[PDB]
Amino acid sequence: PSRIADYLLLPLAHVSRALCIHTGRELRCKVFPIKHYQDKIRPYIQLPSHSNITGIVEVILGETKAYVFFEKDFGDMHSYVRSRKRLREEEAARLFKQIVSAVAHCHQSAIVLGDLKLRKFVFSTEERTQLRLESLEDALSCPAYVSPEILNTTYSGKAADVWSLGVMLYTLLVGRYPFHDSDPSALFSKIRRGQFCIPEHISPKARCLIRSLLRREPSERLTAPEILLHPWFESVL
């Protein structure tokens, strides 16, 4: 029952529906206190573009509050791979590169994500060819995306994000997590011991990549920029 700037705000059922009063077209809007934006969200706005990595079209800063307007997504990547059992290497490589590129771009602007999951990547279009980051805090089935460093102890974080990328890469190709168990002690021991098995239908270049992203030792893992050069991508695309 409300409005700011170009947009009427309609409920759903902490985000809401934004309808542009000029064009008529529907976006989404999430309000924050201005200082939460300044701290936790303004870093993503500083990205060079920004509107491709995140879905954000414009933000409006008042005296008191920040209104972040973004384009609506067409479902997350966890629901996707779950819905498809697993992904063929051709599509998996397309989608993963976008994921890595977004992450690589963030790392270059000093942003460490920390909360990297398949959940965090959402389709920008109805065709579901193109992903963006879900930057705004909005059976397979932490844990699993959690790395040997944080259990043992400070650490990089950027390397920790590459671990998560490795878990994500394994998971879309394989269809389940690299580490999984009924007993959690066993789960965390297998994390800390870097202990997993790749299937044989997975191809040598693809296996090669997963291995180089999932290393106990953080320094020995690739960086997000390095990842994008790896031959797996070019072998299928």
Explained architecture:
There is one protein chain. With 237 residues, this protein is α+β, with helices and mostly antiparallel strands. It folds into two domains: 1-72, Phosphorylase Kinase, domain 1 (2-Layer Sandwich); 73-237, Transferase(Phosphotransferase) domain 1 (Transferase(Phosphotransferase), domain 1), CATH 1.10.510. 38% of the residues lie in helices and 16% in strands. The protein has nine helices and eight strands. It has helices spanning 34-45, 77-83, 89-108, 148-152, 158-174, 184-192, 204-213, 224-227, 231-236, and strands at residues 2-4, 7-10, 15-20, 26-33, 56-61, 65-70, 121-123, 131-133. The strands form two sheets. Strands 1-2-3-4-6-5 form a six-stranded antiparallel sheet, covered by helices on one side. Strands 7-8 form a two-stranded antiparallel sheet. Helix 3 packs antiparallel against helix 5 (158-174) and helix 5 runs antiparallel to helix 7 (204-213). The longest helix is centred in the middle third of the chain and has 20 residues, at 89-108. It comes from Homo sapiens (Human). One of its GO terms (cellular component) is cytosol. This is Tribbles homolog 1.
Task: Count up the domains.
Answer: 2
CATH superfamily assignment of the largest domain? Transferase(Phosphotransferase) domain 1
**Tally of separate helices:** 9
Rg, rounded, reads 19 Å
Shape: globular
Helical content band: 25-40%
**Under the CATH scheme, which class of the largest domain?**
Mainly Alpha
Query: In whole angstroms, how far apart are the ends?
Result: 48 Å
Tell me about the largest β-sheet.
Answer: 6 strands, antiparallel
Widest sheet: strand ordering: 1-2-3-4-6-5
Query: Which structural category do the helix and sheet elements fall into?
Result: alpha+beta
The share of residues in extended strands comes to 15-25%
| The CATH topology of the largest domain | Transferase(Phosphotransferase), domain 1
Give me the strand/helix succession. EEEEHEEHHEEHHHHHH
Oligomeric state of the chains? monomer
Task: Examine the secondary-structure arrangement and name the CATH architecture of the largest domain.
Answer: Orthogonal Bundle
Q: Could you give the count of β-strands?
A: 8
PDB class: transferase
Keywords: kinase, transferase
Assembly: monomeric
Entry title: Pseudokinase domain of Human Tribbles Homolog 1
